[PDB]
Amino acid sequence: IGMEPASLKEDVQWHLLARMVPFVENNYNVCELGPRGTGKSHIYKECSPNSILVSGGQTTVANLFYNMSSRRIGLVGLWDVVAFDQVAGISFKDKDGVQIMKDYMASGSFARGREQMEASASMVFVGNINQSVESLVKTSHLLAPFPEAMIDSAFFDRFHAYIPGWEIPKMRPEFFTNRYGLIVDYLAEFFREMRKRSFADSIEKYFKLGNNLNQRDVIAVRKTVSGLMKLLYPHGQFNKEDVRQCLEYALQVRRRVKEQLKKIGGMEFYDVHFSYIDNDTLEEHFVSVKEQLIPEGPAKPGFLYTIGLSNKGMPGLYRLELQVTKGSGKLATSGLWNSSSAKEQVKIAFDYFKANASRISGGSKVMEHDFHLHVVELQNTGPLSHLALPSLVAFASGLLGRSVQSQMVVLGDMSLGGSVTPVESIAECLQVAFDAGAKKVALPMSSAADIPTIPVELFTKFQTSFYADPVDAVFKGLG
Amino acid sequence: SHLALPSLVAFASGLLGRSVQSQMVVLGDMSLGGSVTPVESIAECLQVAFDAGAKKVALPMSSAADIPTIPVELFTKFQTSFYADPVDAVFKGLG
Amino acid sequence: IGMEPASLKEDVQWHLLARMVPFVENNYNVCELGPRGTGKSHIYKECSPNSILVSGGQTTVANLFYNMSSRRIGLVGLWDVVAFDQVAGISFKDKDG
């Protein structure tokens, strides 16, 4: 492609390979946003006779898809890569453009005029970023620079990959090699020939996808893995570690899109904890996003941290987030590791909250608001079962609209009748809370019997709070 | 006579212009070098704090060894803070 | 061009050569701003049959680059120098222009 690999890090090389992926996998939608000058448009414009760089993004549906009057297939029937440069300015005279593209990317075949025709063009969306990535993450979602008419969850859900164009360094003449390399025509013919094969099923030999991946996530990760496998191993002889590397990269890039979909679409896309399970040793690996435990100060109201022994008995810290909208008292749950025990714990907690609303809220009606509660694990320890009491705490914190105090982890569990339960392994719970950064702990009164079991240096760091009934637990945790 | 640490917290609050946390009673004392002393009559002092309306208490870390001597019902009434050195006592007091 | 070299400074002569430079390099972009009446637009209009002076600047994208309706290339495929006069008001109705 004309670059000097010696001056680029290995992750940068992998991003450059992900740039080549659209050529080698049929119908591979991908979007790449990055700072100017990172050489995004070079490959699609100069180094391939089977790609077209549609300048300005301003195309017409008859031009791109099907000219009914001339009965001629659009761009997608001619080019294997269609790259929309400077995506930020795209606006369609034909509002069908977004719908037709959604159908094409979701299915690969589109119906126009009198026929349903299939085309294998892979669509790439190249965009320029003006602001810092961290500001874009904190104040908005990463897909902000795309046009407003194109910011749809159903639209972005098709994207088989988002590329982190910021991690590739700004291009410099030092990055251009002077050594021998493959002929660009040879390379492009190689890509076009490799389009005919399939490597998406190589993962099933060694790995299995996690439970957080729905059907479209499976499709995206399979396609990206197949593209990378074709680029790196055309011969077909490869080991388990290579498949692991490719699968890690694919899950990471798809996970980025999944985070953006979460931020833009709310309840639908909380299942973002992408992970994969080895087939041999059955152990599970999690993949995060590089560009993105308990910070100081009061977090947003309805957001708390609880600690509890997992299914494996080890202490783990979970963060519970509640979103409150005007509704009919509906309860929505997510991130519960599809565990029925935690689901029922939260159900009993909300039942108590409805039954005891006036005592805590001072007049607020629970039935007039709908609540969505989500669970995010901070220490990959495992699923939590006991969640009634922290869920009630989050409910009251969100409903009253005042934040949970800084660095409190809420402990103990509650029953339907208002009784509290002692915390098992309180020493390890405090150890983890101090490790996680928690400074203040709220404990049930019945737990105080095990205060002597806590070593001195660990117990010194906590402004311990003791409550008698769940209402007192709520008031003490809230402040 | 045991007034060194409360005097230090007083100076810190007055100079920095920060109000101390409401309903917090500072216990223990310090030497000139900053060595913290254990709270004498910790249980009785806590009972007096409960009688006067204290909701928060600040204690030396070394005094934690006398926590098992504290009654359970008395101890559950406070948000108990354990500092390490007088400067940490200041930080606990001023929040 | 019709200019008297003896009545012009060497620097001004080199600027005049830079005026001809667009005619001699393929795909050569250049911008010149000057006071009214300095003879900027004379050469691009009168001194060559291989240049065009697109007056006003409000020329459409289909006229300039490509018109899909007729599938015939715009100006840039025909003339070796395209000079936009009065760059202050040049504007495109289409945003992609």
Residue numbers in the entry:
A (entry chain I): 195 to 486, 491 to 677
B (entry chain C): 583 to 677
C (entry chain J): 195 to 291
Paper quotes:
The final gene in most type 1 BREX systems, termed ‘BrxL’, encodes a large protein (670–700 residues in various species), with much of its sequence predicted to adopt a fold corresponding to the chambered ATP-dependent AAA+ protein family, which are involved in a wide variety of cellular functions throughout all biological kingdoms. In this study we have demonstrated that the BrxL phage restriction factor is a multimeric DNA binding protein that displays ATP-dependent assembly on double stranded DNA.
Grids generated using BrxLE280Q also displayed a mixture of partially and fully assembled protein complexes, with the latter displaying protrusions from each end of the long axis of the complex. A subsequent CryoEM structure determination of full-sized particles produced electron density maps extending to ∼3 Å resolution that correspond to dodecameric particles comprising two six-fold symmetric (hexameric) protein rings, again associated with one another in an antiparallel tail-to-tail arrangement. In addition to the difference in protein copy number and symmetry between the unbound versus DNA-bound BrxL protein assemblages (corresponding to two heptamers versus two hexamers), the BrxLE280Q density maps also demonstrated the unambiguous presence of double stranded DNA spanning the length of the BrxL chamber, which would seem likely to represent DNA from the bacterial expression host that was bound by BrxL during expression and/or cell lysis and then carried through the purification process. The dimensions of the BrxL (E280Q) dodecamer are ∼195 Å in the longest dimension and 140 Å across the exterior diameter of the cylinder. The diameter of the interior chamber is narrowest (∼30 Å) at each end of the protein assemblage, where positively charged loop regions from the NTD and AAA+ ATPase domains of each subunit are in closest contact with the DNA, and considerably wider (∼80 Å) near the chamber's equator, where the C-terminal domain of each subunit makes contacts with the same domain in the opposing protein hexameric ring. Multiple contacts to the DNA backbone, at each end of the bound duplex, are contributed by basic residues extending from loops contributed by the NTD and the AAA+ domains.
